[PDB]
Amino acid sequence: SAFTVWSGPGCNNRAERYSKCGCSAIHQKGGYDFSYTGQTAALYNQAGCSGVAHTRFGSSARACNPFGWKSIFIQC
DSSP states (O other): OEEEEOSSSSSSSOOEEEOSSEEEEOOOOSOEEEEOBSBOEEEESSGGGOSOEEEEESSOOOBOSOOOOSEEEEOO
C-alpha cells in the first residue's frame, strides 16, 4: 500500500508519497491520501512512528484535510 500527500491547502499542490514498509515522517502540510492493497497503515502523531498510532486505514482514503499526525506507518 501507498500513502500520498500535498503541502497545502489540501490535495492541490506538491506531490510526495510514502509507500515503503515501516514508517516515514511527512512534512507536506496539505492533503493526505491513502491506497490500501493487502497492506494496512496507521498514522503516528510523532515522526518515524516513535509513539502509538492514531488513525488506521483498511481501504484507499483520499482525504485533503489539514494534517493531524506526523508520520505514516504501512506494514508489509
